[PDB]
Amino acid sequence: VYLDRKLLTLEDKELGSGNFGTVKKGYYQMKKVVKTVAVKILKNEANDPALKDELLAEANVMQQLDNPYIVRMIGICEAESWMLVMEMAELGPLNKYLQQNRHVKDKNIIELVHQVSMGMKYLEESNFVHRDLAARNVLLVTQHYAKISDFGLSKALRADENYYKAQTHGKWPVKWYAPECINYYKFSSKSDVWSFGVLMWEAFSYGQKPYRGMKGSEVTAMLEKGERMGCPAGCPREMYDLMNLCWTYDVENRPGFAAVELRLRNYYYDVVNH
């Protein structure tokens, strides 16, 4: 899990930046081949142990996961700052991709969202909750290969519980959260199915932001009235029906990822045949 700073070559070009610090492209020397990587680098502006613990917890989740539809961690490095080294997904975030490639076919979008459902079926089987499942957190290897990333808010579920109960509300992606998350601070794999519904909406809307113009509180009020976002232009009815089913208010009656992946799998094969 511990990498050698000597074997890592970082580019001066920064891929992105957040409050945690920066993300840079690089290459890591393996036993023989060189591997292209994406490196999350902590900001060493002010000494903060909270960011360090968050990065180490994220590394601990990623280490436990092994699936073709989840970003693989190479390891961690302690040098100029704390670094999390990941296998590079060259084409980047799904929302930004679709915003820049507006002629991507509905068949290709179905293919990518089904790949995300296969990854989520595996996380559910593994008893991990993602807690930040959104189009911005789906990364593209190619135009036909999506992976789930950003395990920053993820939790390994306790052996005696089907959900994680958050102690205090923090800076949350509220527009992607289910009513039991907002009302009871409870996060399950079914809560992640709700987020997946929002992710599907974003993908069929070519990366448009969900609940445009609205505040978090207005969304909660809208959902409580039984209202849901409309069908995006050109989105197949079967895909909009699936979004609405992910948006089941009551967590007990909402489907799990096994049911959602199967529904997406059969629709995809039907589209392939046409």
Binding site: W172, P173, K175
Partner: peptide
């Protein structure tokens, strides 16, 4: 706009 504090 994406992450809201309580």
């Amino acid at each position: 706009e994406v992450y809201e504090s309580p």
